[PDB]
Amino acid sequence: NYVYIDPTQLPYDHKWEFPRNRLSFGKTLGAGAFGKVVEATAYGLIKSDAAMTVAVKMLKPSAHLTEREALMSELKVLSYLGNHMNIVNLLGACTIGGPTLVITEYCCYGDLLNFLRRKRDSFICSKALDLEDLLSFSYQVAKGMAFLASKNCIHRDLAARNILLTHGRITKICDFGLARDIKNDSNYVVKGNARLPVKWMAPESIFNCVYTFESDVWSYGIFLWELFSLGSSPYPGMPVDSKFYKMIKEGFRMLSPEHAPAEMYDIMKTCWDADPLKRPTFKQIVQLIEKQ
Numbered sequence: 001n002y003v004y005i006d007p008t009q010l011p012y013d014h015k016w017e018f019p020r021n022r023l024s025f026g027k028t029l030g031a032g033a034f035g036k037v038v039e040a041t042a043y044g045l046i047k048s049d050a051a052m053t054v055a056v057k058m059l060k061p062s063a064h065l066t067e068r069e070a071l072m073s074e075l076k077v078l079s080y081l082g083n084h085m086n087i088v089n090l091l092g093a094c095t096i097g098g099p100t101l102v103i104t105e106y107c108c109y110g111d112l113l114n115f116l117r118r119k120r121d122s123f124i125c126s127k128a129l130d131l132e133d134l135l136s137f138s139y140q141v142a143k144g145m146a147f148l149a150s151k152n153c154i155h156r157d158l159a160a161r162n163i164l165l166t167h168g169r170i171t172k173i174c175d176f177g178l179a180r181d182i183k184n185d186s187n188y189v190v191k192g193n194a195r196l197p198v199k200w201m202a203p204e205s206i207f208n209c210v211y212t213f214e215s216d217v218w219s220y221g222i223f224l225w226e227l228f229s230l231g232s233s234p235y236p237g238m239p240v241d242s243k244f245y246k247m248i249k250e251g252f253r254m255l256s257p258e259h260a261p262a263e264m265y266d267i268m269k270t271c272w273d274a275d276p277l278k279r280p281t282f283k284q285i286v287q288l289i290e291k292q
């Protein structure tokens with residue numbers, strides 16, 4: 001049978017190869033469930049004499065098959081999407097002579113989540129973290145998410161921790177470890193018995209194992225929630241078990257963060273519709289924010 005040749009499944013381009021002995025490691029930048037990211041210098045990575053600052057991502061030692069496969073999966077994705085201001089810029093990989101190193105544009109402020117909590121105790125509006133800044137990050141992630149979707153991709157792990165921030169208040173989406181290309185169906189079904197970011201997951205994906213374009217929309221909602229609560233954990237104190245699953249199904253949702261404006265809560269909520277086909281598309285979120 002016939003398939004849309006999936007760009008993110010394609011064997012790998014050796015044009016990204018950058019010799020690892022030209023890299024050097026500084027302090028650790030973060031670590032999620034999949035990889036470890038470390039700060040670095042890449043000598044001669046763009047200009048023959050660069051000394052560029054970068055983020056290098058690599059498997060954590062004693063990583064499993066899943067972690068392994070995923071790191072390659074995001075090399076391949078990052079590759080396919082290419083430069084776009086709001087996605088994380090891929091600049092290289094090292095696959096030869098040591099562990100897979102995935103080289104990324106360094107974002108100097110880190111994950112919104114962490115950034116939010118360092119600057120929560122300093123939040124104001126009209127000017128330091130702004131309300132305009134929070135709006136600005138809402139716009140930029142929706143903008144970037146609307147871009148993935150046009151490129152037939154679903155992130156599958158949109159969360160505050162997987163959004164980076166660089167200098168011009170410019171935000172970059174990262175962690176394409178769970179991202180898949182959806183052109184073939186849309187309804188992408190999770191095969192593995194997986195270990196997933198459940199509190200960011202739309203009910204249809206939890207219960208019926210189906211992710212769609214409008215299921216990143218759900219997570220983007222939990223992310224507007226993270227954004228405007230100045231970095232709170234979703235459903236704080238709430239373990240993921242039957243009590244949590246049941247409150248999602250029966251349709252219960254989080255309240256407005258004390259710092260969210262009415263229209264942003266309104267978007268979140270429509271992002272949280274039980275009916276997948278009632279949620280707005282990021283394209284519509286984008287335009288919903290540009291009226292603010």
Ligand SMILES: Nc1ncnc2c1ncn2[C@@H]1O[C@H](COP(=O)(O)OP(=O)(O)O)[C@@H](O)[C@H]1O
Nearest residue numbers: 030031032033034035037055104107111161175
């Ligand atoms: N390009 C980068 N520049 C700066 N920090 C980064 C970069 N990439 C990742 N990080 C940091 O490392 C953390 C883990 O990155 P991520 O790709 O989500 O790894 P994981 O798959 O393990 O979650 C992020 O939340 C962020 O703090």
Ligand SMILES: [Mg+2]
Nearest residue numbers: 032161162175
């Ligand atoms: Mg992460």
